[PDB]
Ligand binder design. Structure first.
Ligand SMILES: CC1=C(O)/C(=C\N=N\C(=O)c2ccncc2)C(COP(=O)(O)O)=CN1
Ligand SMILES: CC1=C(O)/C(=C\N=N\C(=O)c2ccncc2)C(COP(=O)(O)O)=CN1
Lengths: 429, 428
């Protein structure tokens, strides 16, 4: 039992926040006291106010908070079995979820490794790729290649494939693996980009295990969109030069970009795939790494005899149960129409933002809207403005942006876009 | 899905920990329920009740489906499943942080929440790396530890795992090269600590931290060592200006007979990891704590921040069940409970010492180990335990248990009886 003022006091003294300091925070965190549907209840000047979760709590809350069907699946599982070890045991929530994932991901992804976060599923993906080649008698193939602008997590391997300015930084000179970086992938399709990619890959091929990318949308590294055709070229390059392809769909997964997985826009399958975030409907942390039967059987027949990974809470029944229900809920409705409407709503609402002085781009892709400005967005100016409009927004760098819950009404998208348009206008001043 | 369908979906599509696809020497057993210290498993088409002797890998200290913890979870679920921790704070996080700073070794004032043990370990290393960068000494970037340890499966965590291992020979070259002192022995030996100091001395300018599991090394070999070694480590680290990190992910929350295993020695590390028992085994959550000084040095550094922030950082649901699990631990006489467990483990396992294939028997708090003279065949051990109403998971040459704190004396006796019978079968 703590009051909002007591929460603030404990938090200031004792809580780290994402990429934050202790005792140097420019502004106090705001107290969140509830979340229901698309709305959060927050304390502002000692008063609870309801505001739209424009960001879906970082891509996670696809059906909104406290969706009756998701709450119900969680409590139904809670009464039967909270958790058992996954060593020598299996269970229904893991089986059901693995079943759904293999059916609905791009063709050929036949096996599923559960883990407890996105960064962990990325390191598992890398470990699959590395063990793969050792199982082929090619231990020299151990480096990773990616393109700039990417983000794959904060654990040390994951960091090595993050954008070097995204934070490498300079700050981590050594201690990171030195990976192969291609230039930023452009928005519009240019065959010259893919040709230069291939030439660069070609000369490293004998030391490359895999290419790892976010398909179609790069999220936390700067909300950039690229033509799906590039993914088709990667698949092609990777096949021809014998390098595995990893798609990191932790942010792009489960309908967000207008296809079920963004790889579907290109009609391509990677060899290894990561999912997370929206997987659980934003209730709990869970992730999965899927790989082809070939990858699975090469690992298993290699010297180690096994994938050498296994978190304590692997395949947690509670996480797997709420995920099963989150996935069925998406699939049981006309999700494609929902996303199309959302995209249209975002496009319409954000439109007037391009005629603003500080704004260099306005872009929409599925249920994702971005306003790019020509300077950093001042958080101590931006946050106040959006709160006043009943919206929780979180700009970073020069980007005002949103990934709203799938359940947002036209009135709610209008309200989100209007606060975004306003954040951009104040940037101009 | 029926159990048969679960088996079918599983063998086709599910990776298990440290497992193959399609080459599993044994099928997994379907688990369909868990209540208190008991699992309901399907064996030959029939549900059977078995004791969770391992506490689902150290996690289920209060057993499964404890009413206080179920209710803490459903209460949070009613109010707020999850919000982003960037720009926002909430009551579950504050309550759990308040609790953790109060009960951990003195001087651990700040709390970084993550989603798993391996992450919290990488967070600990990052903290140490950023600390020395903030002091203008970016050369202090290597880690040192002793052999026999385990800190997780992510790539940095792996670098401080015992090299034989999981499994540096097959890895290395992608693993950062850390400094390894010899295996810490069971009984106190001053010459061991003198040599540790001497080895650390010649790497001091490149070491960010010593990282160890205190008192009990879990997944690396279920080895115990004298807590005075931790006193030596704290002294060495202070004199040579290397941070000290205790990985208490397995040892935390009462399990070794003190609240935290660092307490057996009265030592405070600079950085500490907790996990597993933290949530009472309901959900994955972990935490990394460090001193105010480590926090301030990082925060005044070039970065001006600790450069980590998982999507689900400080998840309300996971924090809420954790708050309830810790409070349930503190609101009972846990110390007497663990002593009773230990006495019961020792009494029940005494008989294994005489067995032909047993090389050692050891207990430390609610942890019991029969060390055998050959690796244990799971195809023999598993049905043998199941025939006695117990879920045991041996590894390497070890038959061992870390039972839920709620186990009655008869249940502890049933567990140890099964362990003894597994050990008798190994010897043949
Ligand atoms: C002291 C210590 C640990 O014991 C662990 C993990 N322990 N893992 C198990 O006990 C285990 C054993 C066998 N199979 C799966 C997990 C970890 C890793 O935590 P995580 O496996 O990521 O949740 C870090 N520090
Ligand atoms: C594509 C992709 C990811 O987007 C992420 C994490 N995304 N993080 C956030 O969006 C985020 C944003 C702002 N602050 C903290 C995290 C990760 C890492 O996930 P994790 O943070 O370890 O659960 C891996 N792949």
């Amino acid at each position: 039992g703590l009051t909002p003022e007591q929460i603030i006091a404990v938090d200031g003294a004792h809580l780290w926040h994402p990429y934050s300091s202790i005792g140097r925070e420019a502004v106090s965190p705001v107290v969140a006291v509830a979340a229901h549907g698309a709305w959060l209840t927050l304390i502002r000047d000692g008063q609870p106010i309801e505001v739209l979760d424009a960001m879906s709590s970082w891509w996670t809350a696809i059906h909104g908070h406290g969706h009756p069907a998701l709450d119900q699946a969680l409590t139904t599982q809670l009464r039967v079995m909270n958790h058992v070890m996954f060593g020598g045991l299996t269970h229904e929530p893991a089986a059901r979820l693995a079943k759904l994932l293999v059916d609905i991901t791009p063709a050929g992804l036949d096996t599923v490794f559960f883990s407890d976060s996105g960064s962990v599923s990325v390191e598992v993906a890398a470990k699959m790729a590395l063990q793969y080649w050792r199982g082929r008698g090619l231990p020299g193939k151990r480096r990773l290649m990616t393109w700039r602008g990417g983000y794959h997590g904060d654990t040390f391997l994951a960091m090595s494939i993050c954008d070097p300015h995204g934070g490498m930084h300079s700050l981590w000179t050594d201690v990171l693996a030195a990976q192969v970086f291609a230039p930023q992938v452009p928005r519009d399709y240019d065959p010259a980009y893919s040709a230069a990619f291939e030439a660069q890959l070609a000369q490293h091929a004998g030391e490359l295990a895999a290419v790892v990318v976010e398909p179609v949308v790069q999220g936390a590294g700067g909300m950039r969109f690229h033509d799906p055709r590039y993914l088709h070229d990667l698949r092609d390059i990777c096949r021809r030069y014998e390098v595995l392809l990893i798609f990191d769909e932790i942010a792009t997964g489960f309908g967000r970009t207008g296809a079920l997985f963004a790889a579907d826009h290109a009609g391509v399958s990677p060899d290894i795939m990561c999912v997370g975030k929206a997987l659980t409907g934003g209730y709990l942390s869970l992730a999965a790494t899927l790989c082809t039967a070939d990858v699975a059987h090469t690992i298993s027949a290699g010297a180690a005899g096994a994938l050498m990974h296994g978190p304590t809470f692997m395949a947690n029944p509670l996480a797997c149960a709420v995920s099963v229900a989150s996935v069925e809920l998406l699939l049981g409705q006309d999700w494609r129409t929902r996303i199309t409407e959302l995209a249209a709503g975002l496009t319409a609402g954000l439109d007037t933002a391009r005629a603003l002085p500080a704004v260099t781009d306005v872009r929409v892709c599925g249920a994702i809207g971005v306003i790019e400005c020509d300077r950093p967005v001042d958080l101590a100016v931006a946050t106040p403005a959006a709160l006043d409009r009943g919206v929780w927004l979180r700009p970073f760098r020069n980007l005002v942006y949103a990934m709203p819950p799938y359940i947002c009404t036209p009135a709610e998208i209008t309200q989100i876009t209007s606060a975004m348009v306003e954040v951009a206008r104040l940037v101009g001043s």
